[PDB]
Design a protein around this nucleic acid. Structure first.
Length: 49
RNA sequence: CUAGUACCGAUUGAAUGGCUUAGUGAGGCCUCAGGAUCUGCUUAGAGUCAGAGCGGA
């Protein structure tokens, strides 16, 4: 069970967990800082136009 | 950060409308004049040959 499943964290509730977004785990894509990240898409869109 | 809501207040920017000072004023109508032209009569041009003179539009 360990070698099959060690990657699984286990949680009480997804809505309450503190899972980090840009997690450093190795299966995360090579591009992260390479990716564009925006936040307020609404306030970006209308501003650009 | 964004949204919403308002005040003044600068340009008169740049316009719309009412009132008002001063000055100007189209057009037709009435009236004082003017007379391009057209035409009747008359002594008189000829057996249309001119001129003048008295009228009308």
């Amino acid at each position: 069970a360990i070698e099959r499943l060690k990657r699984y964290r286990g949680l009480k509730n997804l809505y309450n967990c503190d899972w980090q977004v840009d997690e450093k785990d190795p299966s995360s894509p090579a591009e992260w800082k390479r990716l564009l990240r925006i936040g307020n898409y609404k306030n970006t869109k209308n501003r650009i136009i």
